[PDB]
Amino acid sequence: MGPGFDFAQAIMKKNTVIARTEKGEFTMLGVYDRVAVIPTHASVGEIIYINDVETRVLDACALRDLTDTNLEITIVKLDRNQKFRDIRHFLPRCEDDYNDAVLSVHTSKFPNMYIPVGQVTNYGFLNLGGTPTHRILMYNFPTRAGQCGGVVTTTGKVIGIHVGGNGAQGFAAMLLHSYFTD
């Protein structure tokens, strides 16, 4: 409807796949080459389904900060025959607050879903399903089961992936450029 949705749509159409694990279907953001991200609670194993294709996982890493605190981001390298468009130049370098964010989801359950979530707070610490977690972004939208892995964007920036909610607020794990240096 506006340039927020325009940027979000451009990311969804070229840089997302449907990831299925034993824990369900997730929006999965491709970042560059065969490297993608997914919430750590997806429990990625040796094999994952990508758009319903059986795919070997060549490497997977559950990120933690240098306090050895969960970040709830898993970086996955896929044995896929095709590279993602490189979107690393759209990742923020530092922890920040944002205005006017969109949360975008693409699964069997929620195809082509775009949610204007508004103002995003650098929340920091969250007890997420009982796990102490750092670098959490918060937005005032009642997000639901099925939106995990959803991409959080502003005009010009890919800032996070949806990892939980409490019925009134939603929570995303930050994406930082430094996670994807090669």
Curated annotation (Swiss-Prot):
Domain of life, source organism: Viruses
Protein name in UniProt: Protease 3C
Coiled coil: none
Active site: 41 (for protease 3c activity), 72 (for protease 3c activity), 148 (for protease 3c activity)
Functional summary from the UniProt entry: Major viral protease that mediates proteolytic processing of the polyprotein. Cleaves host EIF5B, contributing to host translation shutoff. Also cleaves host PABPC1, contributing to host translation shutoff. Binds and inhibits host IFIH1/MDA5, thereby inhibiting the type-I IFN production and the establishment of the antiviral state. Cleaves host MAP3K7/TAK1, resulting in inhibition of TRAF6-triggered NF-kappa-B induction. Cleaves host TICAM1; this interaction allows the virus to disrupt host TLR3 signaling. Cleaves host IRF7, resulting in inhibition of type-I IFN production.
Subcellular location field: Host cytoplasm
Self-association and partners: Interacts with host IFIH1/MDA5; this interaction inhibits host IFIH1.
Reaction(s) catalysed by this chain's protein: Selective cleavage of Gln-|-Gly bond in the poliovirus polyprotein. In other picornavirus reactions Glu may be substituted for Gln, and Ser or Thr for Gly
